[PDB]
Amino acid sequence: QTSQDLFSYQALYSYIPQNDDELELRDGDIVDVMEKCDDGWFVGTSRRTKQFGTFPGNYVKPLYL
């Protein structure tokens, strides 16, 4: 429950978060982004492990819904 069908991305790479407040990105995993930082990193939730935080939207690709 980030919003509903707001915006979902698929991970291009597997990324190791610098903090537990960041989201674990894994190659092919999907993350729904709820909030956008203009700095490029976004806030989302992991579709696989359902964790919430910030993730670098540099490792994800714009999907459709």
Residue 11, beta-bridge partner list: 60
What span, in angstroms and rounded, lies between the C-alpha atoms of 30 and 16?
15
**Order of strands across the sheet with 8-11?**
52-56, 41-46, 30-36, 8-11, 60-62
Cα-based distances in Å from 35 to 24, 54, 61: 17, 9, 15
Angle at 47 between CA 45 and CA 53, to 5 degrees: 15
**Method underlying the structure:** NMR
Q: What residue segments make up the domains of the chain, in order of their start?
A: 1-65
DSSP label at 4? S
What CATH code is assigned to 1-65? 2.30.30.40
Q: Decide: 44 and 56 in contact? Cβ < 8 Å.
A: no
